[PDB]
Amino acid sequence: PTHLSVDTKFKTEGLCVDIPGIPKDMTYRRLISMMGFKMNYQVNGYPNMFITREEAIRHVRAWIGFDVEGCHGTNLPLQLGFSTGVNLVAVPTPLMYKGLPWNVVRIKIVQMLSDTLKNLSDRVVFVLWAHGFELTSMKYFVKIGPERTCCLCDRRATCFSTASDTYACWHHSIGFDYVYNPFMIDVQQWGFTGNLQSNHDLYCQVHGNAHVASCDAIMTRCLAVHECFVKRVDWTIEYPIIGDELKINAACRKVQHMVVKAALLADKFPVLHDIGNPKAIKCVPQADVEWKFYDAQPCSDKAYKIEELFYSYHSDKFTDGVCLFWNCNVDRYPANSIVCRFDTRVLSNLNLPGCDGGSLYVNKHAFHTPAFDKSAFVNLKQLPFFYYSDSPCESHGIDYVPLKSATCITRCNLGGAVCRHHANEYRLYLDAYNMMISAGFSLWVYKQFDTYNLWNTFT
Numbered sequence: 001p002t003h004l005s006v007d008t009k010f011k012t013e014g015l016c017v018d019i020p021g022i023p024k025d026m027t028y029r030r031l032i033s034m035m036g037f038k039m040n041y042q043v044n045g046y047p048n049m050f051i052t053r054e055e056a057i058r059h060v061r062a063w064i065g066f067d068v069e070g071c072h073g074t075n076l077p078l079q080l081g082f083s084t085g086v087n088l089v090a091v092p093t094p095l096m097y098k099g100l101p102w103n104v105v106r107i108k109i110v111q112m113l114s115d116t117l118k119n120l121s122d123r124v125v126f127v128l129w130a131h132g133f134e135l136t137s138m139k140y141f142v143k144i145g146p147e148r149t150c151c152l153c154d155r156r157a158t159c160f161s162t163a164s165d166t167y168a169c170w171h172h173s174i175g176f177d178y179v180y181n182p183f184m185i186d187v188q189q190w191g192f193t194g195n196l197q198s199n200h201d202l203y204c205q206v207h208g209n210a211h212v213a214s215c216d217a218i219m220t221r222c223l224a225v226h227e228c229f230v231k232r233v234d235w236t237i238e239y240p241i242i243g244d245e246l247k248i249n250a251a252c253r254k255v256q257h258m259v260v261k262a263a264l265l266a267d268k269f270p271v272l273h274d275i276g277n278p279k280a281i282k283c284v285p286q287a288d289v290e291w292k293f294y295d296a297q298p299c300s301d302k303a304y305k306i307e308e309l310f311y312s313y314h315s316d317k318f319t320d321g322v323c324l325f326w327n328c329n330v331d332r333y334p335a336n337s338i339v340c341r342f343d344t345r346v347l348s349n350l351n352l353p354g355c356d357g358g359s360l361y362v363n364k365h366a367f368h369t370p371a372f373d374k375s376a377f378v379n380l381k382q383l384p385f386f387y388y389s390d391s392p393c394e395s396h397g398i399d400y401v402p403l404k405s406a407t408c409i410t411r412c413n414l415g416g417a418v419c420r421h422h423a424n425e426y427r428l429y430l431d432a433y434n435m436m437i438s439a440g441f442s443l444w445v446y447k448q449f450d451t452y453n454l455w456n457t458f459t
Protein backbone atom coordinates (compact mmCIF):
# COMPACT_ATOMS: atom_id res chain seq x y z
CA PRO A 1 0.00 0.00 0.00
CA THR A 2 2.36 2.72 -1.29
CA HIS A 3 0.54 4.48 -4.18
CA LEU A 4 -3.14 5.40 -4.78
CA SER A 5 -4.73 2.57 -6.86
CA VAL A 6 -6.18 3.80 -10.16
CA ASP A 7 -9.09 1.40 -9.38
CA THR A 8 -9.98 3.51 -6.23
CA LYS A 9 -13.36 5.26 -6.46
CA PHE A 10 -13.56 8.99 -7.10
CA LYS A 11 -16.68 10.85 -5.87
CA THR A 12 -17.93 12.95 -8.83
CA GLU A 13 -20.65 15.06 -7.12
CA GLY A 14 -18.40 18.17 -7.03
CA LEU A 15 -17.76 17.77 -10.80
CA CYS A 16 -21.38 17.68 -12.06
CA VAL A 17 -22.00 21.47 -12.41
CA ASP A 18 -19.14 21.87 -14.96
CA ILE A 19 -19.68 18.25 -16.20
CA PRO A 20 -23.44 17.49 -16.26
CA GLY A 21 -24.34 13.82 -16.62
CA ILE A 22 -21.03 12.61 -15.08
CA PRO A 23 -21.35 8.97 -13.86
CA LYS A 24 -21.65 8.60 -10.11
CA ASP A 25 -19.54 5.41 -10.34
CA MET A 26 -16.04 6.50 -11.28
CA THR A 27 -12.46 5.24 -10.75
CA TYR A 28 -9.21 7.23 -11.05
CA ARG A 29 -8.50 5.03 -14.16
CA ARG A 30 -11.70 6.23 -15.91
CA LEU A 31 -11.30 9.87 -14.75
CA ILE A 32 -7.69 10.05 -16.07
CA SER A 33 -8.93 8.65 -19.40
CA MET A 34 -11.78 11.29 -19.46
CA MET A 35 -9.12 13.98 -18.78
CA GLY A 36 -7.57 13.01 -22.18
CA PHE A 37 -4.57 11.03 -20.84
CA LYS A 38 -3.51 7.47 -21.77
CA MET A 39 -1.55 5.45 -19.16
CA ASN A 40 -0.96 2.42 -21.55
CA TYR A 41 -0.42 -0.12 -18.61
CA GLN A 42 2.93 1.53 -17.83
CA VAL A 43 5.04 0.18 -14.92
CA ASN A 44 7.58 3.00 -15.05
CA GLY A 45 7.33 4.92 -11.76
CA TYR A 46 4.19 6.95 -12.52
CA PRO A 47 1.30 4.64 -11.45
CA ASN A 48 -1.29 7.40 -11.03
CA MET A 49 -1.56 11.21 -11.61
CA PHE A 50 -3.48 11.41 -8.29
CA ILE A 51 -1.87 10.64 -4.94
CA THR A 52 -2.93 9.70 -1.37
CA ARG A 53 -3.13 12.20 1.56
CA GLU A 54 -0.06 10.43 3.08
CA GLU A 55 1.95 10.92 -0.18
CA ALA A 56 0.73 14.57 -0.35
CA ILE A 57 1.92 15.26 3.24
CA ARG A 58 5.36 13.79 2.44
CA HIS A 59 5.55 16.24 -0.52
CA VAL A 60 4.02 19.35 1.07
CA ARG A 61 6.89 21.46 -0.43
CA ALA A 62 5.51 20.59 -3.93
CA TRP A 63 1.93 21.88 -3.14
CA ILE A 64 0.45 24.39 -5.60
CA GLY A 65 -3.23 25.19 -5.22
CA PHE A 66 -4.87 25.26 -8.64
CA ASP A 67 -8.29 26.44 -9.71
CA VAL A 68 -9.93 27.10 -13.10
CA GLU A 69 -12.97 29.35 -13.52
CA GLY A 70 -15.00 29.78 -16.71
CA CYS A 71 -14.67 33.45 -17.81
CA HIS A 72 -17.52 32.87 -20.29
CA GLY A 73 -15.44 24.93 -22.08
CA THR A 74 -13.72 24.66 -25.57
CA ASN A 75 -15.73 27.75 -26.67
CA LEU A 76 -15.11 30.06 -23.65
CA PRO A 77 -12.01 31.71 -22.06
CA LEU A 78 -10.67 30.07 -18.86
CA GLN A 79 -9.09 31.79 -15.86
CA LEU A 80 -6.29 29.66 -14.37
CA GLY A 81 -5.43 30.58 -10.79
CA PHE A 82 -2.47 29.35 -8.72
CA SER A 83 -1.75 29.67 -4.96
CA THR A 84 1.26 31.85 -5.99
CA GLY A 85 -1.37 34.63 -6.60
CA VAL A 86 -1.09 34.34 -10.40
CA ASN A 87 -4.16 34.42 -12.74
CA LEU A 88 -3.63 33.58 -16.42
CA VAL A 89 -6.46 33.77 -18.99
CA ALA A 90 -6.37 31.04 -21.66
CA VAL A 91 -8.40 31.60 -24.85
CA PRO A 92 -9.21 28.62 -27.15
CA THR A 93 -8.86 30.83 -30.33
CA PRO A 94 -3.64 38.97 -7.21
CA LEU A 95 -1.83 39.29 -10.59
CA MET A 96 -4.36 39.48 -13.49
CA TYR A 97 -3.13 38.70 -17.04
CA LYS A 98 -5.18 39.29 -20.26
CA GLY A 99 -6.39 36.43 -22.53
CA LEU A 100 -3.80 34.50 -24.60
CA PRO A 101 -3.75 31.16 -26.48
CA TRP A 102 -2.72 27.91 -24.76
CA ASN A 103 0.62 27.65 -26.63
CA VAL A 104 1.87 30.79 -24.81
CA VAL A 105 -0.04 30.17 -21.49
CA ARG A 106 1.74 26.77 -21.08
CA ILE A 107 5.20 28.47 -21.40
CA LYS A 108 4.24 30.84 -18.55
CA ILE A 109 3.02 27.90 -16.39
CA VAL A 110 6.37 26.08 -16.76
CA GLN A 111 8.34 29.28 -15.90
CA MET A 112 6.14 30.03 -12.83
CA LEU A 113 6.20 26.47 -11.40
CA SER A 114 9.98 26.13 -12.07
CA ASP A 115 10.77 29.42 -10.25
CA THR A 116 8.51 28.60 -7.33
CA LEU A 117 9.59 24.96 -6.92
CA LYS A 118 13.27 24.57 -8.00
CA ASN A 119 14.56 25.16 -4.43
CA LEU A 120 11.62 23.38 -2.70
CA SER A 121 10.93 20.04 -4.34
CA ASP A 122 11.58 17.48 -7.13
CA ARG A 123 7.88 17.66 -8.22
CA VAL A 124 4.59 19.64 -8.27
CA VAL A 125 1.40 18.49 -6.47
CA PHE A 126 -1.65 20.41 -7.74
CA VAL A 127 -3.96 20.83 -4.77
CA LEU A 128 -7.56 21.00 -6.04
CA TRP A 129 -11.13 21.58 -4.87
CA ALA A 130 -12.23 19.90 -8.12
CA HIS A 131 -15.34 21.10 -9.96
CA GLY A 132 -14.44 19.98 -13.53
CA PHE A 133 -12.75 22.78 -15.58
CA GLU A 134 -9.37 22.35 -13.82
CA LEU A 135 -9.23 18.62 -14.64
CA THR A 136 -10.35 19.07 -18.30
CA SER A 137 -7.80 21.91 -18.79
CA MET A 138 -4.77 19.75 -17.79
CA LYS A 139 -4.40 18.21 -21.30
CA TYR A 140 -3.50 21.71 -22.57
CA PHE A 141 -0.33 22.03 -20.43
CA VAL A 142 0.51 18.53 -19.08
CA LYS A 143 2.32 15.61 -20.76
CA ILE A 144 2.62 12.25 -18.95
CA GLY A 145 4.72 9.10 -19.47
CA PRO A 146 7.46 7.08 -17.78
CA GLU A 147 9.62 8.61 -15.04
CA ARG A 148 12.64 10.31 -16.64
CA THR A 149 15.78 12.21 -15.69
CA CYS A 150 16.79 15.75 -16.64
CA CYS A 151 18.77 16.22 -19.92
CA LEU A 152 21.27 18.50 -18.09
CA CYS A 153 21.39 16.74 -14.62
CA ASP A 154 20.46 13.68 -12.45
CA ARG A 155 17.22 15.12 -10.97
CA ARG A 156 13.86 13.69 -12.12
CA ALA A 157 12.18 15.38 -15.07
CA THR A 158 9.33 17.81 -14.29
CA CYS A 159 9.10 19.59 -17.70
CA PHE A 160 9.10 18.63 -21.39
CA SER A 161 9.91 20.67 -24.50
CA THR A 162 8.11 20.14 -27.85
CA ALA A 163 10.77 22.34 -29.57
CA SER A 164 13.74 20.06 -28.71
CA ASP A 165 11.97 16.76 -27.76
CA THR A 166 13.84 16.87 -24.38
CA TYR A 167 13.07 16.64 -20.62
CA ALA A 168 14.22 18.89 -17.79
CA CYS A 169 13.97 19.29 -14.02
CA TRP A 170 12.78 22.63 -12.40
CA HIS A 171 16.40 24.00 -12.53
CA HIS A 172 16.96 23.45 -16.29
CA SER A 173 13.56 24.04 -17.87
CA ILE A 174 14.04 27.52 -19.43
CA GLY A 175 12.04 27.67 -22.66
CA PHE A 176 10.19 24.40 -21.83
CA ASP A 177 6.46 24.37 -22.64
CA TYR A 178 4.92 21.28 -20.94
CA VAL A 179 4.51 20.19 -17.33
CA TYR A 180 5.73 16.58 -17.23
CA ASN A 181 4.38 13.93 -14.81
CA PRO A 182 2.73 16.31 -12.29
CA PHE A 183 0.83 15.00 -9.27
CA MET A 184 -2.51 16.16 -7.89
CA ILE A 185 -4.98 15.66 -5.07
CA ASP A 186 -8.65 16.63 -4.80
CA VAL A 187 -9.45 17.95 -1.26
CA GLN A 188 -13.18 17.30 -1.96
CA GLN A 189 -12.41 13.54 -1.78
CA TRP A 190 -11.64 13.94 1.95
CA GLY A 191 -15.32 14.24 2.92
CA PHE A 192 -16.51 17.81 3.41
CA THR A 193 -19.95 19.37 3.72
CA GLY A 194 -20.48 22.67 1.92
CA ASN A 195 -18.41 24.73 -0.48
CA LEU A 196 -14.67 25.71 -0.34
CA GLN A 197 -15.22 29.17 1.16
CA SER A 198 -17.40 27.83 4.02
CA ASN A 199 -14.82 25.17 5.02
CA HIS A 200 -11.76 27.48 4.62
CA ASP A 201 -13.43 30.36 6.57
CA LEU A 202 -14.04 28.03 9.56
CA TYR A 203 -10.26 28.13 10.30
CA CYS A 204 -8.85 31.19 8.48
CA GLN A 205 -9.50 34.96 8.26
CA VAL A 206 -6.27 35.95 6.41
CA HIS A 207 -7.35 34.77 2.93
CA GLY A 208 -10.37 36.53 1.51
CA ASN A 209 -12.52 35.66 -1.51
CA ALA A 210 -12.07 38.33 -4.19
CA HIS A 211 -13.97 35.93 -6.57
CA VAL A 212 -10.89 35.14 -8.76
CA ALA A 213 -9.33 31.71 -9.46
CA SER A 214 -6.08 32.44 -7.50
CA CYS A 215 -8.21 33.30 -4.40
CA ASP A 216 -9.81 29.84 -4.56
CA ALA A 217 -6.42 28.20 -5.33
CA ILE A 218 -4.96 29.89 -2.19
CA MET A 219 -8.01 28.90 0.00
CA THR A 220 -7.71 25.27 -1.30
CA ARG A 221 -4.04 24.87 -0.36
CA CYS A 222 -4.65 26.67 3.04
CA LEU A 223 -7.51 24.25 3.80
CA ALA A 224 -5.32 21.26 2.83
CA VAL A 225 -2.49 22.59 5.13
CA HIS A 226 -5.04 23.02 8.00
CA GLU A 227 -6.30 19.44 7.62
CA CYS A 228 -2.84 17.87 7.34
CA PHE A 229 -0.72 20.03 9.65
CA VAL A 230 -3.00 21.99 11.99
CA LYS A 231 -5.85 19.67 13.08
CA ARG A 232 -3.79 16.51 12.35
CA VAL A 233 -0.08 16.47 13.33
CA ASP A 234 2.59 13.91 12.42
CA TRP A 235 6.06 14.91 13.69
CA THR A 236 7.60 11.50 12.74
CA ILE A 237 7.56 12.27 8.98
CA GLU A 238 11.06 13.13 7.86
CA TYR A 239 11.69 15.68 5.08
CA PRO A 240 14.87 15.93 2.96
CA ILE A 241 17.58 18.58 3.39
CA ILE A 242 17.10 21.33 0.78
CA GLY A 243 19.02 24.24 2.37
CA ASP A 244 20.74 25.37 5.58
CA GLU A 245 18.85 22.98 7.93
CA LEU A 246 21.96 21.53 9.66
CA LYS A 247 23.69 24.89 10.18
CA ILE A 248 20.49 26.58 11.44
CA ASN A 249 19.79 23.82 14.01
CA ALA A 250 23.46 23.88 15.14
CA ALA A 251 23.33 27.71 15.41
CA CYS A 252 20.09 27.44 17.44
CA ARG A 253 21.85 25.10 19.91
CA LYS A 254 24.90 27.44 20.16
CA VAL A 255 22.75 30.58 20.72
CA GLN A 256 20.52 28.88 23.35
CA HIS A 257 23.53 27.76 25.40
CA MET A 258 25.12 31.23 25.07
CA VAL A 259 22.05 33.26 26.03
CA VAL A 260 20.93 31.02 28.91
CA LYS A 261 24.43 30.67 30.39
CA ALA A 262 24.88 34.48 30.32
CA ALA A 263 21.45 35.15 31.83
CA LEU A 264 22.25 32.80 34.75
CA LEU A 265 25.68 34.48 35.24
CA ALA A 266 24.28 38.07 35.04
CA ASP A 267 21.24 37.68 37.33
CA LYS A 268 22.07 34.48 39.34
CA PHE A 269 18.47 33.10 39.26
CA PRO A 270 18.11 30.28 41.80
CA VAL A 271 15.54 28.43 39.62
CA LEU A 272 14.87 28.03 35.85
CA HIS A 273 11.45 26.82 34.55
CA ASP A 274 12.08 25.24 31.12
CA ILE A 275 8.71 25.21 29.29
CA GLY A 276 8.21 23.32 26.03
CA ASN A 277 9.83 20.28 24.36
CA PRO A 278 8.97 17.15 26.44
CA LYS A 279 12.38 15.79 25.24
CA ALA A 280 14.41 18.87 26.35
CA ILE A 281 17.88 18.55 27.86
CA LYS A 282 19.53 21.22 30.13
CA CYS A 283 21.16 23.63 27.60
CA VAL A 284 23.72 24.76 30.30
CA PRO A 285 24.59 21.47 32.11
CA GLN A 286 27.26 23.02 34.38
CA ALA A 287 24.90 25.76 35.74
CA ASP A 288 24.22 25.89 39.51
CA VAL A 289 20.47 26.66 39.03
CA GLU A 290 17.54 24.38 39.98
CA TRP A 291 16.42 23.16 36.55
CA LYS A 292 12.72 22.26 36.33
CA PHE A 293 11.05 21.00 33.12
CA TYR A 294 7.41 21.40 32.02
CA ASP A 295 6.15 19.54 28.94
CA ALA A 296 4.32 21.24 26.11
CA GLN A 297 4.31 20.03 22.52
CA PRO A 298 4.65 22.63 19.70
CA CYS A 299 1.26 24.30 19.21
CA SER A 300 0.14 24.25 15.59
CA ASP A 301 -3.27 25.99 15.85
CA LYS A 302 -3.32 28.96 18.32
CA ALA A 303 -0.52 30.10 20.68
CA TYR A 304 -0.77 28.57 24.19
CA LYS A 305 -2.59 30.75 26.74
CA ILE A 306 -0.11 31.48 29.62
CA GLU A 307 -3.10 31.06 32.00
CA GLU A 308 -3.56 27.41 30.93
CA LEU A 309 0.21 26.60 30.92
CA PHE A 310 0.79 28.07 34.40
CA TYR A 311 -2.45 28.03 36.37
CA SER A 312 -4.94 25.37 37.66
CA TYR A 313 -2.42 24.25 40.39
CA HIS A 314 5.70 21.98 39.67
CA SER A 315 7.54 24.78 41.47
CA ASP A 316 4.02 26.49 41.15
CA LYS A 317 5.78 29.85 41.55
CA PHE A 318 6.89 30.53 37.95
CA THR A 319 7.43 34.16 39.23
CA ASP A 320 10.55 32.80 41.09
CA GLY A 321 13.72 32.82 38.99
CA VAL A 322 13.47 32.73 35.21
CA CYS A 323 11.25 31.07 32.58
CA LEU A 324 12.79 29.70 29.39
CA PHE A 325 10.40 29.46 26.41
CA TRP A 326 12.54 28.00 23.60
CA ASN A 327 10.20 27.79 20.61
CA CYS A 328 7.24 27.43 23.02
CA ASN A 329 4.68 29.91 21.54
CA VAL A 330 2.51 31.60 24.16
CA ASP A 331 -0.02 34.47 23.91
CA ARG A 332 1.88 36.73 26.39
CA TYR A 333 5.21 35.96 27.96
CA PRO A 334 5.78 36.63 31.66
CA ALA A 335 8.30 39.42 32.50
CA ASN A 336 10.96 37.00 33.89
CA SER A 337 11.50 35.24 30.51
CA ILE A 338 14.20 34.13 28.01
CA VAL A 339 12.37 33.55 24.71
CA CYS A 340 13.00 32.22 21.21
CA ARG A 341 9.94 32.79 18.97
CA PHE A 342 9.88 31.85 15.29
CA ASP A 343 8.66 34.74 13.09
CA THR A 344 6.20 33.22 10.64
CA ARG A 345 6.56 36.25 8.29
CA VAL A 346 10.15 35.27 7.33
CA LEU A 347 10.64 34.55 3.58
CA SER A 348 12.69 31.32 3.08
CA ASN A 349 12.82 27.89 1.33
CA LEU A 350 12.10 26.26 4.78
CA ASN A 351 9.07 28.39 5.64
CA LEU A 352 5.99 27.72 3.53
CA PRO A 353 2.82 29.91 3.73
CA GLY A 354 0.28 28.55 6.21
CA CYS A 355 -3.20 28.83 7.70
CA ASP A 356 -4.69 31.97 9.36
CA GLY A 357 -1.43 33.97 9.35
CA GLY A 358 0.67 31.03 10.53
CA SER A 359 3.40 29.32 8.53
CA LEU A 360 4.51 25.77 7.91
CA TYR A 361 8.17 25.58 8.97
CA VAL A 362 9.80 22.52 7.39
CA ASN A 363 13.23 21.56 8.77
CA LYS A 364 13.60 17.73 9.26
CA HIS A 365 9.95 17.76 10.42
CA ALA A 366 6.94 19.94 9.49
CA PHE A 367 5.73 22.42 12.16
CA HIS A 368 2.74 24.66 11.52
CA THR A 369 3.49 27.72 13.73
CA PRO A 370 0.78 30.25 14.79
CA ALA A 371 1.03 33.81 13.43
CA PHE A 372 3.82 35.95 14.87
CA ASP A 373 2.29 38.54 17.28
CA LYS A 374 4.42 41.49 18.54
CA SER A 375 2.10 41.89 21.55
CA ALA A 376 3.25 38.48 22.98
CA PHE A 377 6.49 40.32 23.98
CA VAL A 378 5.13 43.48 25.72
CA ASN A 379 6.76 42.48 29.09
CA LEU A 380 10.13 41.81 27.39
CA LYS A 381 12.73 43.58 25.23
CA GLN A 382 14.64 42.43 22.12
CA LEU A 383 17.78 40.54 23.14
CA PRO A 384 20.88 42.23 21.66
CA PHE A 385 23.83 40.37 20.12
CA PHE A 386 26.76 39.65 22.44
CA TYR A 387 29.34 36.87 22.62
CA TYR A 388 30.42 35.62 26.10
CA SER A 389 33.32 33.35 27.03
CA ASP A 390 35.14 32.35 30.24
CA SER A 391 37.35 29.71 28.46
CA PRO A 392 41.14 30.23 28.63
CA CYS A 393 42.83 32.56 26.13
CA GLU A 394 44.82 29.94 24.21
CA SER A 395 44.97 29.42 20.38
CA HIS A 396 45.82 25.65 19.78
CA GLY A 397 46.13 24.45 16.16
CA ILE A 398 42.52 30.56 8.73
CA ASP A 399 44.46 33.88 8.74
CA TYR A 400 43.94 36.80 11.22
CA VAL A 401 42.88 40.52 11.36
CA PRO A 402 42.68 41.93 14.93
CA LEU A 403 39.17 41.98 16.45
CA LYS A 404 37.84 45.15 18.09
CA SER A 405 34.26 44.82 19.47
CA ALA A 406 32.39 46.16 22.50
CA THR A 407 30.16 42.98 22.42
CA CYS A 408 33.06 40.47 22.75
CA ILE A 409 32.60 39.76 26.47
CA THR A 410 35.93 38.05 27.32
CA ARG A 411 38.75 38.40 29.88
CA CYS A 412 41.15 39.38 27.02
CA ASN A 413 38.80 42.17 25.85
CA LEU A 414 38.43 43.32 29.50
CA GLY A 415 42.26 43.35 29.63
CA GLY A 416 42.20 45.58 26.53
CA ALA A 417 43.10 43.26 23.59
CA VAL A 418 41.07 40.33 22.13
CA CYS A 419 43.21 37.16 21.84
CA ARG A 420 43.21 35.10 18.57
CA HIS A 421 41.20 32.21 20.06
CA HIS A 422 38.34 34.45 21.28
CA ALA A 423 38.35 36.45 18.00
CA ASN A 424 37.93 33.21 15.95
CA GLU A 425 35.23 32.04 18.41
CA TYR A 426 33.46 35.45 18.34
CA ARG A 427 33.37 35.48 14.49
CA LEU A 428 32.10 31.89 14.32
CA TYR A 429 29.40 32.72 16.91
CA LEU A 430 28.33 35.92 15.11
CA ASP A 431 27.94 33.78 11.91
CA ALA A 432 25.80 31.23 13.80
CA TYR A 433 23.78 34.11 15.29
CA ASN A 434 23.06 35.78 11.89
CA MET A 435 22.14 32.42 10.37
CA MET A 436 19.57 31.78 13.15
CA ILE A 437 18.11 35.32 12.85
CA SER A 438 17.90 35.27 9.03
CA ALA A 439 16.19 31.81 9.27
CA GLY A 440 13.30 33.66 11.04
CA PHE A 441 13.97 33.19 14.76
CA SER A 442 13.65 36.15 17.15
CA LEU A 443 15.12 36.43 20.67
CA TRP A 444 13.57 38.25 23.64
CA VAL A 445 14.70 38.69 27.26
CA TYR A 446 13.54 40.15 30.63
CA LYS A 447 14.03 43.99 30.71
CA GLN A 448 16.71 43.90 33.47
CA PHE A 449 19.12 41.86 31.26
CA ASP A 450 22.38 43.72 30.97
CA THR A 451 25.64 42.37 29.54
CA TYR A 452 27.51 44.95 31.72
CA ASN A 453 26.85 42.47 34.60
CA LEU A 454 28.98 39.82 32.75
CA TRP A 455 32.34 41.70 33.02
CA ASN A 456 32.58 41.00 36.81
CA THR A 457 32.47 37.21 36.17
CA PHE A 458 36.28 37.65 35.37
CA THR A 459 37.81 38.69 38.76
Ligand SMILES: O=C(NCCc1ccncc1)c1ccccc1F
Binding pocket: 063, 064, 065, 082, 083, 084, 085, 116, 120, 221, 347, 348, 349, 350, 351, 352, 353
Ligand atom coordinates in the same frame (compact mmCIF):
# COMPACT_ATOMS: atom_id res chain seq x y z
O1 LIG B 1 7.00 31.89 -0.04
C1 LIG B 1 7.90 31.25 -0.60
N1 LIG B 1 7.64 30.21 -1.38
C2 LIG B 1 6.35 30.05 -2.05
C3 LIG B 1 5.66 28.77 -1.66
C4 LIG B 1 4.26 28.69 -2.21
C5 LIG B 1 3.60 29.81 -2.71
C6 LIG B 1 2.31 29.68 -3.19
N2 LIG B 1 1.63 28.54 -3.19
C7 LIG B 1 2.27 27.47 -2.71
C8 LIG B 1 3.56 27.49 -2.23
C9 LIG B 1 9.33 31.69 -0.52
C10 LIG B 1 9.61 33.01 -0.18
C11 LIG B 1 10.91 33.47 -0.12
C12 LIG B 1 11.96 32.63 -0.34
C13 LIG B 1 11.73 31.32 -0.69
C14 LIG B 1 10.43 30.88 -0.76
F1 LIG B 1 10.24 29.58 -1.09
Ligand SMILES: O=C(NCCc1ccncc1)c1ccccc1F
Binding pocket: 276, 277, 278, 296, 297, 298, 326, 327, 328, 342, 361, 367, 369
Ligand atom coordinates in the same frame (compact mmCIF):
# COMPACT_ATOMS: atom_id res chain seq x y z
O1 LIG C 1 8.45 22.70 17.53
C1 LIG C 1 9.57 23.01 17.14
N1 LIG C 1 10.65 22.29 17.43
C2 LIG C 1 10.56 20.94 17.99
C3 LIG C 1 11.00 20.89 19.44
C4 LIG C 1 10.06 21.64 20.35
C5 LIG C 1 10.29 22.96 20.72
C6 LIG C 1 9.41 23.60 21.57
N2 LIG C 1 8.30 23.04 22.04
C7 LIG C 1 8.06 21.79 21.66
C8 LIG C 1 8.90 21.05 20.85
C9 LIG C 1 9.75 24.21 16.25
C10 LIG C 1 8.61 24.81 15.73
C11 LIG C 1 8.68 25.92 14.91
C12 LIG C 1 9.90 26.48 14.64
C13 LIG C 1 11.05 25.93 15.14
C14 LIG C 1 10.95 24.82 15.94
F1 LIG C 1 12.10 24.30 16.44
Ligand SMILES: [Zn+2]
Binding pocket: 150, 151, 152, 153, 154, 155, 168, 169, 170, 171, 172
Ligand atom coordinates in the same frame (compact mmCIF):
# COMPACT_ATOMS: atom_id res chain seq x y z
ZN1 LIG D 1 18.29 19.39 -14.36
Ligand SMILES: [Zn+2]
Binding pocket: 200, 204, 205, 206, 207, 218, 219, 222, 223, 354, 355, 356
Ligand atom coordinates in the same frame (compact mmCIF):
# COMPACT_ATOMS: atom_id res chain seq x y z
ZN1 LIG E 1 -6.57 30.58 4.57
Ligand SMILES: [Zn+2]
Binding pocket: 392, 393, 394, 410, 411, 412, 413, 418, 419, 420, 421, 422
Ligand atom coordinates in the same frame (compact mmCIF):
# COMPACT_ATOMS: atom_id res chain seq x y z
ZN1 LIG F 1 40.89 35.57 24.96
